[PDB]
Amino acid sequence: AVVKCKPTSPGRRHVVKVVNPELHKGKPFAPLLEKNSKSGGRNNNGRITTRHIGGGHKQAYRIVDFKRNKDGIPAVVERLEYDPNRSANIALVLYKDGERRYILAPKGLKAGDQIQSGVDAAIKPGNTLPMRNIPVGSTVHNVEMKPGKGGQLARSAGTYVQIVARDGAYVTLRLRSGEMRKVEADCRATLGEVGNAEHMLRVLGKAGAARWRGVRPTVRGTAMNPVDHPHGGGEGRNFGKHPVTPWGVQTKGKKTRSNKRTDKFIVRRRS
Amino acid sequence: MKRTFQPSVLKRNRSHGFRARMATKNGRQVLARRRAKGRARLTVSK
Amino acid sequence: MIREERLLKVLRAPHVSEKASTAMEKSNTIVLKVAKDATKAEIKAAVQKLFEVEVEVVNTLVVKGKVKRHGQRIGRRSDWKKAYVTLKEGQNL
RNA sequence: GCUCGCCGGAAGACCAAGGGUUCCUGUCCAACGUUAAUCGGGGCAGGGUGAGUCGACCCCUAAGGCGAGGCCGAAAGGCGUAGUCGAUGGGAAACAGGUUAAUAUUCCUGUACUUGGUGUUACUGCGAAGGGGGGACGGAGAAGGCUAUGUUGGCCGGGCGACGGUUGUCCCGGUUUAAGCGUGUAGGCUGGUUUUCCAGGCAAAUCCGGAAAAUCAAGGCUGAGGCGUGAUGACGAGGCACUACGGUGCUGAAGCAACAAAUGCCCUGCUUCCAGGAAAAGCCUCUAAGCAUCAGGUAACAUCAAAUCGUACCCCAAACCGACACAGGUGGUCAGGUAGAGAAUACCAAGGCGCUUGAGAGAACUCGGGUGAAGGAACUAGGCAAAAUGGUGCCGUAACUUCGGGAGAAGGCACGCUGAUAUGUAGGUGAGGUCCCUCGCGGAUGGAGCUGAAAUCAGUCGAAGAUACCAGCUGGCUGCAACUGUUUAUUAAAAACACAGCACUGUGCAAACACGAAAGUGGACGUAUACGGUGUGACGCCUGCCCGGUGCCGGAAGGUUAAU
RNA sequence: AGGACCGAACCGACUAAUGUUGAAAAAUUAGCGGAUGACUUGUGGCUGGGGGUGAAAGGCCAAUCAAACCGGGAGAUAGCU
Ligand SMILES: [Mg+2]
Ligand SMILES: [Mg+2]
Ligand SMILES: [Mg+2]
Ligand SMILES: [Mg+2]
Ligand SMILES: [Mg+2]
Ligand SMILES: [Mg+2]
Ligand SMILES: [Mg+2]
Ligand SMILES: [Mg+2]
Ligand SMILES: [Mg+2]
Ligand SMILES: [Mg+2]
Ligand SMILES: [Mg+2]
Ligand SMILES: [Mg+2]
Ligand SMILES: [Mg+2]
Ligand SMILES: [Mg+2]
Ligand SMILES: [Mg+2]
Ligand SMILES: [Mg+2]
Ligand SMILES: [Mg+2]
Ligand SMILES: [Mg+2]
Ligand SMILES: [Mg+2]
Ligand SMILES: [Mg+2]
Ligand SMILES: [Mg+2]
Ligand SMILES: [Mg+2]
Ligand SMILES: [Mg+2]
Ligand SMILES: [Mg+2]
Ligand SMILES: [Mg+2]
Ligand SMILES: [Mg+2]
Ligand SMILES: [Mg+2]
Ligand SMILES: [Mg+2]
Ligand SMILES: [Mg+2]
Ligand SMILES: [Mg+2]
Ligand SMILES: [Mg+2]
Ligand SMILES: [Mg+2]
Ligand SMILES: [Mg+2]
Ligand SMILES: [Mg+2]
Ligand SMILES: [Mg+2]
Ligand SMILES: [Mg+2]
Ligand SMILES: [Mg+2]
Ligand SMILES: [Mg+2]
Ligand SMILES: [Mg+2]
Ligand SMILES: [Mg+2]
Ligand SMILES: [Mg+2]
Ligand SMILES: [Mg+2]
Ligand SMILES: [Mg+2]
Numbered sequence A: 001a002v003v004k005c006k007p008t009s010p011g012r013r014h015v016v017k018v019v020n021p022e023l024h025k026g027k028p029f030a031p032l033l034e035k036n037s038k039s040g041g042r043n044n045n046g047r048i049t050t051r052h053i054g055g056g057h058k059q060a061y062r063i064v065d066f067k068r069n070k071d072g073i074p075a076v077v078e079r080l081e082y083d084p085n086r087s088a089n090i091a092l093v094l095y096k097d098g099e100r101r102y103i104l105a106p107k108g109l110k111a112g113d114q115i116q117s118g119v120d121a122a123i124k125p126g127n128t129l130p131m132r133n134i135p136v137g138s139t140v141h142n143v144e145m146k147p148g149k150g151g152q153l154a155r156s157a158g159t160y161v162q163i164v165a166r167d168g169a170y171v172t173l174r175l176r177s178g179e180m181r182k183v184e185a186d187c188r189a190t191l192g193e194v195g196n197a198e199h200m201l202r203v204l205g206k207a208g209a210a211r212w213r214g215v216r217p218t219v220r221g222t223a224m225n226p227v228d229h230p231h232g233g234g235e236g237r238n239f240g241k242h243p244v245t246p247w248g249v250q251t252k253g254k255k256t257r258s259n260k261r262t263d264k265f266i267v268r269r270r271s
Numbered sequence B: 001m002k003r004t005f006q007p008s009v010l011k012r013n014r015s016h017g018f019r020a021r022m023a024t025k026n027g028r029q030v031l032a033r034r035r036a037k038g039r040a041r042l043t044v045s046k
Numbered sequence C: 001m002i003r004e005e006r007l008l009k010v011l012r013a014p015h016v017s018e019k020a021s022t023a024m025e026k027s028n029t030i031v032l033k034v035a036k037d038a039t040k041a042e043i044k045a046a047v048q049k050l051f052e053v054e055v056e057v058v059n060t061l062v063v064k065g066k067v068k069r070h071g072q073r074i075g076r077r078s079d080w081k082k083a084y085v086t087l088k089e090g091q092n093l
Numbered sequence D: 001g002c003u004c005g006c007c008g009g010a011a012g013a014c015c016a017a018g019g020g021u022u023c024c025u026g027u028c029c030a031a032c033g034u035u036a037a038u039c040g041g042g043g044c045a046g047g048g049u050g051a052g053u054c055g056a057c058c059c060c061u062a063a064g065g066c067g068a069g070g071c072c073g074a075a076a077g078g079c080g081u082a083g084u085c086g087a088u089g090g091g092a093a094a095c096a097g098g099u100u101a102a103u104a105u106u107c108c109u110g111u112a113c114u115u116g117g118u119g120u121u122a123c124u125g126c127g128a129a130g131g132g133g134g135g136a137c138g139g140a141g142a143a144g145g146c147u148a149u150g151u152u153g154g155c156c157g158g159g160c161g162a163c164g165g166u167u168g169u170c171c172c173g174g175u176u177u178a179a180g181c182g183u184g185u186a187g188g189c190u191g192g193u194u195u196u197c198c199a200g201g202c203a204a205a206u207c208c209g210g211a212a213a214a215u216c217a218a219g220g221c222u223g224a225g226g227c228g229u230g231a232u233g234a235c236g237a238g239g240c241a242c243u244a245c246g247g248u249g250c251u252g253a254a255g256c257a258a259c260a261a262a263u264g265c266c267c268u269g270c271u272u273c274c275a276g277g278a279a280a281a282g283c284c285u286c287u288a289a290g291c292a293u294c295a296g297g298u299a300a301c302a303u304c305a306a307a308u309c310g311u312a313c314c315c316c317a318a319a320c321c322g323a324c325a326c327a328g329g330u331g332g333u334c335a336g337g338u339a340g341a342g343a344a345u346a347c348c349a350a351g352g353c354g355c356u357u358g359a360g361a362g363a364a365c366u367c368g369g370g371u372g373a374a375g376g377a378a379c380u381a382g383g384c385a386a387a388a389u390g391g392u393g394c395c396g397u398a399a400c401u402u403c404g405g406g407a408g409a410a411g412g413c414a415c416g417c418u419g420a421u422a423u424g425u426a427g428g429u430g431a432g433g434u435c436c437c438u439c440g441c442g443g444a445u446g447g448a449g450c451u452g453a454a455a456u457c458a459g460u461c462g463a464a465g466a467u468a469c470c471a472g473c474u475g476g477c478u479g480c481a482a483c484u485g486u487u488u489a490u491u492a493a494a495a496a497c498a499c500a501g502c503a504c505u506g507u508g509c510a511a512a513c514a515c516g517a518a519a520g521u522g523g524a525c526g527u528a529u530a531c532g533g534u535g536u537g538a539c540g541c542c543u544g545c546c547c548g549g550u551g552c553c554g555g556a557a558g559g560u561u562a563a564u
Numbered sequence E: 001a002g003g004a005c006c007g008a009a010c011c012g013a014c015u016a017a018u019g020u021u022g023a024a025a026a027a028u029u030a031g032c033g034g035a036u037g038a039c040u041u042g043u044g045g046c047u048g049g050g051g052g053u054g055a056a057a058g059g060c061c062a063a064u065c066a067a068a069c070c071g072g073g074a075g076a077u078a079g080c081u
């Protein structure tokens, strides 16, 4: 559900809130948590290497089954949980033989379903299997990129890939981003679309909001002094630059990708 | 009003103490000089 | 533990004072300067032998020697263990 | 010594950090002390810090640090694996009273408790660096039950009033008692036990997880306080003797109830929400290598052990940071009486103080204040500064609006005391007595006593009853910024920055980007509903035309063109 | 419920006067803003000088900052006083 908040107070009047009743209440399943410590965006040289990252809420990490290896063994959806560390919700699944696991909650997953993996597995929302055994045309999420390495593509709320060609030993995915890239067909992948999809109807509605998600403020270069940012100073609102990174590199359109090493695999660049 | 020197033994010995000087080339060198100039107190101690 | 050598070396001197005195009256306790490195045990042991009396319990503390700076250049008095030795009840020397 | 005044959510009392003898006594007065000083945080000498259970060491880990071998780097050196360090967090146990000139939960008295070694005895599967439990975790809000505490009555000791009255419905004081042990209440959570079987818990498992049945429903886990004991005790006014008049010894009454009541406790609870809320050991259990008449394991008793180092004193300051005995700064704990919403504020209590030159004068002028005829912004850059408003409850309140607001708009009305309803009302509280019963810290009945607003009527005093302190001035027009936030420590708090929102633009993950000769690492344990760069700045209504210039994207046939 | 309202603590720093060889190398007094949050604060850690950090003022990095402090090249050079 997607809710408007009443204007009982400015900075709460523009709040649009995504509240979901099918989500477990209370702490996750402890056995699957680790520590995760915040980083201010600083690396092992103590230097800020990525701007704007500080504070806001504390976060436990939940171990998520990106790989999906327990083939042949069914499991059922104990329940649906929120996860502070990503936009997708998640499924607490009980495997027949006792072992438990988290997985990315896909579009329609309800409590008490039966997901499964392996070179067989019923082609149904929730199930994992190699793509050489997935019908071209299918739409699939959490897509492995090397066989075995585990999910890397389409892991985010609302997203999915669509297989649009087999052929060869590789398939050819339509990436959420418009791109089309070949990818060896033994790379596993999941039936369905990744779940939470009204994610992108939230509005925050107030500055804090963003803070308490670890985001610190963004200072326009045109608000800095020449010394600081290539976008210079002013003297009653001036710019006159050719838009750039803080570090003399160009935005408004210069291309950055440079791999060669992985050019082979890309078949159509996004548009 | 709040001035710049706010003591703290724990921090002191960590920042300049004998052992910290010993940790490294250029702290061993602080000590080294101080010994050459014949200092009474190499560092600050118990 | 004996190391009778030690037990002889561990009792240094009696210690005199109001407190020390009233402490002998009221509490059948006796107060000694004892090696800095001595343990309550070592203190009990040697007191038993050397002073043939029965020791019920031993308390210690370390006295910090005062400081007396005489113009620019200063000086400090060294540090010693003070020893409260209680005497069981069979009370003698 | 007797007054007087000041603080009393502090100007008291405690901790911690920092200080390092400032502590206590004797003695001294040069210099230090904004004055004298016989005094002192000054000189000099002496005394003073006592712990199994307060703290630190110790065990555990956080961020972070170091780091065999290792990866990388002209040398220096940077990273980092196993490990090892690092509390600001987890981890065993003590209380009340007494005593010193100065230490005390440490010494004494009394009464406890913790975990180990040794033994004895009875009884048993014990056994990790491993598994599982657990330790183990946010915010907000709610209201019940409690205690700390206090009020009054009672009880006990004392009192009969410097001046009219005070043998009583009078006055004053006190009325305090711990840990521990026992009990398992208010209340919270969860159904239990047996058997069988299993792809999980790196091997193993009796444990955890999962699947089956069978069976009984009452079982367990947690848990403040009360009560009992501890206590034959301690403390307790006051007496009674001595007194170097400083004190010491001796003895010692009552020691209850009702009512009010935290912000403390039950509560690591409950309810609820999005931002979704440390780790590791101790601890319980489970087995592995193992050991099997041993060792161990469990329990009673008995016994030995618990080291070392801190402990004086200052504590929101004369001892700490401020060159000063400096109107500054400095985290945490304790919260009495009356009035009060209150931790505000005024006055007291306990406790601590009158701030280390005083004495007179009673000019100008300065500073800080009180009142002011008539006038009332005429002042002035500007109502700067003043003056004024100021509580509660009810009545009532416009434009405009994003329907929340505006709004405490504006403006009215009441306010003290006494009596009556009602010799104290509604409410709260709740004892005897009665009956029950799984009889308990139980239920129902019952209403004594206790406490107790608000209201209307009437009467009454003053110039005035939100009487002091304390405590909104209101309204109309209009610029800019949506808004709360941020900022020039020390002349700029704003219309500047940020901001939710929008847009462009890059980015397929070994991402772009960034710190890095590099290794390594942030980005991210993320993956295009994501992440970066840039500009715009809620929202409503909108966002037109120009690609010549400059930038950028695409292109390629020619032309020109490097090393070679 | 809320970057909700009023208002102590706490955080701040809008106005005036005082002070200006100060009580003080930025404060006192009376008024003022926030005061459940982008709040406030203890303890310890990390980032280092053409480097940091910066809700951006050239702000802050130990009474300082359009390039900290210390030592060194060092008796820099000074057609200037
Ligand atoms: Mg932005
Ligand atoms: Mg921006
Ligand atoms: Mg600027
Ligand atoms: Mg530049
Ligand atoms: Mg201009
Ligand atoms: Mg003892
Ligand atoms: Mg000791
Ligand atoms: Mg004080
Ligand atoms: Mg001295
Ligand atoms: Mg003098
Ligand atoms: Mg003194
Ligand atoms: Mg002295
Ligand atoms: Mg090495
Ligand atoms: Mg290292
Ligand atoms: Mg350690
Ligand atoms: Mg600690
Ligand atoms: Mg004392
Ligand atoms: Mg035994
Ligand atoms: Mg474990
Ligand atoms: Mg009570
Ligand atoms: Mg009379
Ligand atoms: Mg003390
Ligand atoms: Mg003074
Ligand atoms: Mg002072
Ligand atoms: Mg007050
Ligand atoms: Mg005086
Ligand atoms: Mg004075
Ligand atoms: Mg006046
Ligand atoms: Mg007048
Ligand atoms: Mg008049
Ligand atoms: Mg008038
Ligand atoms: Mg004029
Ligand atoms: Mg005029
Ligand atoms: Mg004014
Ligand atoms: Mg006024
Ligand atoms: Mg009345
Ligand atoms: Mg105008
Ligand atoms: Mg603004
Ligand atoms: Mg300024
Ligand atoms: Mg200002
Ligand atoms: Mg973005
Ligand atoms: Mg702008
Ligand atoms: Mg608010």
Ligand SMILES: [Mg+2]
Pocket (backbone or CB within 6 Å): E007, E035
């Ligand atoms: Mg306020």
Ligand SMILES: [Mg+2]
Pocket (backbone or CB within 6 Å): none
């Ligand atoms: Mg003020």
Ligand SMILES: [Mg+2]
Pocket (backbone or CB within 6 Å): none
């Ligand atoms: Mg400065």
Ligand SMILES: [Mg+2]
Pocket (backbone or CB within 6 Å): none
């Ligand atoms: Mg330069």
Ligand SMILES: [Mg+2]
Pocket (backbone or CB within 6 Å): E073
């Ligand atoms: Mg030279």
Ligand SMILES: [Mg+2]
Pocket (backbone or CB within 6 Å): none
């Ligand atoms: Mg020169």
